[PDB]
UniProtKB/Swiss-Prot annotation:
Positions carrying Phosphoserine: 177
Example of a GO biological process term: translational initiation
Gene behind this protein: EIF4E
GO cellular component, one term: nuclear speck
Protein name: Eukaryotic translation initiation factor 4E
Modifications the protein undergoes after translation, according to the UniProt entry: Phosphorylation increases the ability of the protein to bind to mRNA caps and to form the eIF4F complex. Phosphorylation also enhances its mRNA transport function. Phosphorylation at Ser-177 is not essential for protein synthesis.
Lineage of producing organism: Eukaryota, Metazoa, Chordata, Craniata, Vertebrata
Keyword terms of this UniProt record: Acetylation, Autism, Autism spectrum disorder, Chromosomal rearrangement, Cytoplasm, Host-virus interaction, Initiation factor, mRNA transport, Nucleus, Phosphoprotein, Protein biosynthesis, RNA-binding, Translation regulation, Transport
Organism, as annotated: Homo sapiens
Disorder this protein is connected to according to its UniProt record: Autism 19: A complex multifactorial, pervasive developmental disorder characterized by impairments in reciprocal social interaction and communication, restricted and stereotyped patterns of interests and activities, and the presence of developmental abnormalities by 3 years of age. Most individuals with autism also manifest moderate intellectual disability.
Molecular functions per Gene Ontology: DNA-binding transcription factor binding; enzyme binding; eukaryotic initiation factor 4G binding; mRNA cap binding; RNA 7-methylguanosine cap binding; RNA binding; RNA cap binding; translation initiation factor activity
Record note on what altering residue 21 to A does: Does not affect ability to rescue growth of yeast lacking a functional EIF4E/CDC33 gene
Family designation: Belongs to the eukaryotic initiation factor 4E family.
A Pfam family that the UniProt record links to this protein: IF4E
Function according to Swiss-Prot or TrEMBL: Acts in the cytoplasm to initiate and regulate protein synthesis and is required in the nucleus for export of a subset of mRNAs from the nucleus to the cytoplasm which promotes processes such as RNA capping, processing and splicing. Component of the protein complex eIF4F, which is involved in the recognition of the mRNA cap, ATP-dependent unwinding of 5'-terminal secondary structure and recruitment of mRNA to the ribosome.
Amino acid sequence: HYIKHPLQNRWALWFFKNDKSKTWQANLRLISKFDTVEDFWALYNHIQLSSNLMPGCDYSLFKDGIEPMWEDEKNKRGGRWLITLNKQQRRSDLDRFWLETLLCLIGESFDDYSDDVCGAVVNVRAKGDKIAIWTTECENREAVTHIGRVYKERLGLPPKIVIGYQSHADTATKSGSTTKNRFVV
Ligand SMILES: CN1CN([C@@H]2O[C@H](COP(=O)(O)OP(=O)(O)OP(=O)(O)O)[C@@H](O)[C@H]2O)c2nc(N)[nH]c(=O)c21
Ligand SMILES: O=C(O)/C(Cc1ccccc1[N+](=O)[O-])=N/Nc1nc(-c2ccc(Br)cc2)cs1
């Protein structure tokens, strides 16, 4: 006799394939949804590792009903904690960071503040991979800095590796690299 173990939230995994020829939203696809521990692992164990995705592709894991784009009602006032990897971190760090990030999401690791969490995004880029946790209100300093502190610790980043929180509104009018930060931790 085997019962499934429900998650606190239902989650959706999305795939993105870069193509600057096409409008951004056109490049996004919903893959599938899950709401149990068992189904999370069945999906994770089945699918390609972030380290193996083609340059230009993304995975996003977002709460059911939130599309992984700035436009969504739950993101437009929000922002993201951004982890930028160097080229050598592609191997034997990207996959660890991504799984630890997924587990922060589906395990509701930020306690009461996990409610402010929208999802997480991994960008596979030749320039330097990126992982981010998206939250719903960029002006909620308490929530945002709590999530950032816990997240940085969970990933075991050295203290002197400083990570930044960008508002999506700023990002949409510049670039995630040249975007100035609202917060650091
Ligand atoms: C998250 N993005 C990204 N994006 C478009 O896609 C561009 C590239 O964003 P990105 O893929 O997140 O990062 P990256 O490829 O490393 O490029 P960059 O250095 O400009 O940040 C952005 O400059 C923006 O024009 C978006 N466009 C819309 N309409 N909604 C969105 O949510 C997003
Ligand atoms: O053109 C490609 O390269 C595409 C199709 C695509 C997708 C988005 C936008 C455009 C296009 N396109 O150009 O046709 N790849 N699709 C992929 N799906 C997965 C995938 C992985 C795990 C699970 Br579980 C299910 C699916 C990996 S790559």
